[PDB]
Amino acid sequence: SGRLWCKAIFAGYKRGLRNQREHTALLKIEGVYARDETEFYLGKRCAYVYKAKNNTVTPGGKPNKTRVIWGKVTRAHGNSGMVRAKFRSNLPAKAIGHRIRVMLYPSRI
Amino acid sequence: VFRRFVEVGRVAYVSFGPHAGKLVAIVDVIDQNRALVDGPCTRVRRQAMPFKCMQLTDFILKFPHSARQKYVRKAWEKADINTKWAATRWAKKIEARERKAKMTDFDRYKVMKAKKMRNRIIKNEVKKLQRAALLKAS
């Protein structure tokens, strides 16, 4: 019926200043604005869902145009409730400031 | 304009820090921006407390400016502060905030279904009252 994923804004890459490391991604999950509010989301699965030109087979039914890069929340990042995540192939940099889905189902409740 | 004053013996509701949620009786003023407060009947051990971390109420319990804990426990139990505190609208909407936070998934389903029907009946009577608002002149 309704939505089954929290909304994480892909902020940008794991980086210093003059040196970024693309293997880790920094997520900003909406609502959670502290380090003592982000224990729940540690270990959860993340999806960058996009759609592209060609048809790609779907697990569960018909070949659609939609595609995924599955990730995983690893750590808390800094003092004001941001999150490190890591994806099966590195996320594309066109995705910066775009929506990715924080799932619930490596569930700990 | 000011009605609530930092006095010797005014109660003050601590908002954040260690004892967030309890009531302390301001005993003595250390400096401009820190105070000495006692909360025996409310489980606050006597200590120094900053003025920033207290939202002060409107109860005054009267004792000298350096009395020990026995005589502020006396004045608390006498003046009946902890029972009079729960009477206030303040303590009632504090009590309500925690219940809404505590609310379960099944409780969230039950509250949705009751509010729906409360809204539906108010949506009727407000429109039936705007008939007698309209027809008096027009």
């Binding site: 400031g97 | 509250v111 509010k115 108010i122 009577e125 009252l129 705007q130």
Partner: protein, 199 residues
């Protein structure tokens, strides 16, 4: 899904710091009443800082030089532009999303405007310190449309007031159409009350 920020009583850099980061995080921000924006320090000082900005033009051809935009919206817009990588695409795609307006235009007159309390003059200045309005600063440094904006914003203040009055009237009728219904929503309210939604 659009932020409609009011600008009445907010400080230039304080507000522009939060608008710059929120619009880099993919939001669409709309800052209405850009002339209400305050600046810390007295008026004379703030005017002197703008006139110093005016003097900086390209010596050989001012057609290429720094464009000294004068409307309070465009002053604020350049102040947000300062806090962005505007020479790169994600800095341009950010500025594209920000929209600014002198007074309040029509789609946003009939909306509730949010307030940033982290960038608000009452809570970030002392009550004793001096400050200057971006609207008056714009007018004295060569803005033309201060006289028109005052009368047009006074017109919607009259319209919105009459509306607000008509909403007070609806609330008193909901206030009456609950108290007449006291006998038949006494069961429904109880399970709202025990979950702290009406105490």
């Amino acid at each position: 899904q659009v932020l409609v920020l009011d600008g009445r009583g907010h400080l230039l850099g304080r507000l522009a710091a939060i608008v710059a980061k929120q619009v880099l995080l993919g939001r669409k921000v709309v800052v209405v009443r850009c002339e209400g924006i305050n600046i810390s320090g007295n008026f004379y000082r703030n005017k002197l800082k703008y006139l110093a900005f005016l003097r900086k033009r390209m010596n050989t051809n001012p057609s290429r030089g720094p464009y000294h935009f004068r409307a309070p919206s465009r002053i604020f817009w350049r102040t947000v532009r300062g806090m962005l990588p505007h020479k790169t695409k994600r800095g341009q795609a950010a500025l594209d999303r920000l929209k600014v307006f002198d007074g309040i235009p029509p789609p946003y007159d009939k909306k509730k405007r949010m307030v940033v309390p982290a960038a608000l003059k009452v809570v970030r200045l002392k009550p004793t310190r001096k400050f200057a309005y971006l609207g008056r600063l714009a007018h004295e440094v060569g803005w033309k449309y201060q006289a028109v904006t005052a009368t047009l914003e006074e017109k919607r203040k009259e319209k919105a007031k009459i509306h607000y009055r008509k909403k007070k009237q609806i609330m008193r009728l909901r206030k009456q159409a609950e108290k007449n219904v006291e006998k038949k929503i006494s069961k429904f309210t109880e399970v709202l009350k025990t979950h702290g939604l009406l105490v």
